[PDB]
């Protein structure tokens, strides 16, 4: 895959999660967008690296708020927050990412 | 919680997943909608029970197609298909459900 990434979820709704991605060089990236509950948010990589904060709540600059919370079929002890990112390439099919953070409740 | 539900995922993209829910009686339900890649799909419960098919592909009546596939940060051996459902109640906050099915790739 052309992208290295992970999500670092927080323990508290006031502390945003951090979405971190690095592009692997050529074929290059046309654009990258994150679908957030508050709208579609573009991402730019400086020299191929980006760290994005994703907020669990609305309280509060390019901001992206998680979709959620969601209930999950098996476990009644957690809820899901999520967004999705789409990065389009100059040549090829797009990469679609699922960014998931569970929070207690 | 006011709803009993689970998702039965399939092993093959030609076989849809089945979303199954039963309402627990009073306070009643105003409406229920599923956000699908092909649009917003309403759900009616007959006597409080519903089984809905969710298709992984477009090939093919009230149809709902999963959003996806999505890549996941840790595992490169699977992709995610998903949709979300919102059921509104006569009195109270809405119930939001996350319906997730992983498929190999
Ligand atoms: C599922 O429920 C268990 C407890 O029953 C919990 O420890 C676990 O974190 C839950 N799974 C997720 C993905 O949160
Ligand atoms: C995560 O990857 C492992 C193998 O590394 C796989 O067996 C497992 O099904 C994956 N998790 C999910 C949720 O698919």
From Swiss-Prot, chains A, B:
Subcellular location: Cell membrane; Secreted, Extracellular space, Extracellular matrix
Phenotype upon changing residue 53 to P: Does not abolish species-specific lysin binding
Disulfide bond sites: 9-101, 36-64
VERL repeat ranges per the UniProt record: 41-105
UniProt-annotated glycosylation sites, renumbered to this chain: 75
PTM description: N-glycosylated. About half of the glycoprotein mass corresponds to carbohydrate chains. N-glycosylation is not required for lysin binding.
Superkingdom of origin organism: Eukaryota
Phenotypic consequence of residue 8 to Y: Does not abolish species-specific lysin binding
Role this protein plays: Structural component of the egg vitelline envelope; forms long filaments. Functions as a species-specific receptor for the sperm protein lysin; prevents fertilization by sperm from other species. Each VERL chain can bind multiple copies of the sperm protein lysin; this creates a 3 um hole in the egg vitelline envelope through which the sperm passes.
Assembly behavior: May form disulfide-linked homodimers. Interacts (via VERL repeats) with sperm lysin. Each VERL chain can bind numerous lysin molecules.
Domain comment quoted from the record: VERL repeat 2 is important for species-specific lysin binding, even if it has lower affinity for lysin than VERL repeat 3. VERL repeats 3 to 22 have high sequence similarity, indicating they all can bind lysin equally well, but they do not play a role in species-specific sperm selection. VERL repeat 1 does not bind lysin.
Protein name: Vitelline envelope sperm lysin receptor
Species this chain originates from: Haliotis rufescens (California red abalone)
Gene from which the chain derives: VERL
Residues of the full protein shown: 176 to 284 of 3722
């Amino acid at each position: 895959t052309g992208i290295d990434w992970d999500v670092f979820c927080s323990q508290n709704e006031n502390i945003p999660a951090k979405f971190i991605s690095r592009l692997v060089a050529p074929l290059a990236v046309e654009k990258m967008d994150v679908d957030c509950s508050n709208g579609l948010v573009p991402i730019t990589h400086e020299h191929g690296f980006n760290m994005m904060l994703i907020q669990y709540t609305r309280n509060k600059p390019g901001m992206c708020v998680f979709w959620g919370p969601y209930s999950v079929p098996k476990n009644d002890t957690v809820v899901l927050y999520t967004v999705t990112a789409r990065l389009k390439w100059s040549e090829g099919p797009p990469t679609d990412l699922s960014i998931q953070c569970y929070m207690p409740k």
